[PDB]
Design a binder for these strands. Structure first.
Length: 48
RNA sequence: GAGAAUGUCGGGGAGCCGAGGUUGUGAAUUGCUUUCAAAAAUUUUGAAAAGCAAUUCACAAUAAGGAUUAUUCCGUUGUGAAAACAUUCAAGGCGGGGCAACUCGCCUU
């Protein structure tokens, strides 16, 4: 904080792909799976 | 000035449902008025009917009307003479979703 600023509103948050990240959280909580089942195809499907 | 992304404040349109109210029918109870209709001393009481009601319940309709049997609707909007429109609108295929009806995406004219 003490030396740099990022040219955007200092106290504002900006969207960072909520969809995939929240899918990742819900796919993490289920467990009992390999940590590779989340790919482009699976993510787009479950989104649909 | 234009364009895209992110938030804030408003507006418009469409849709799925709910509870009353009102008018009318039927009923339970109780009234005001009038006539029949008897008794009694112009007046008081009793039977019946009608008019108007009140409290509660069930039901019918809720813009007059016109479709249709899809678990679908059109009727208070705008334009304007055509009483004609607008407010829904193609073909396919490649998929996701369900008991399936049906719903949701992608691809080329």
């Amino acid at each position: 904080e003490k030396t740099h600023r990022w040219n955007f509103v200092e106290d504002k948050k900006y969207p960072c792909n909520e969809t995939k990240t929240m899918i990742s959280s819900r796919l993490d909580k289920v467990e009992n799976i390999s940590d590779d089942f989340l790919t482009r195809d699976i993510e787009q499907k479950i989104w649909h």
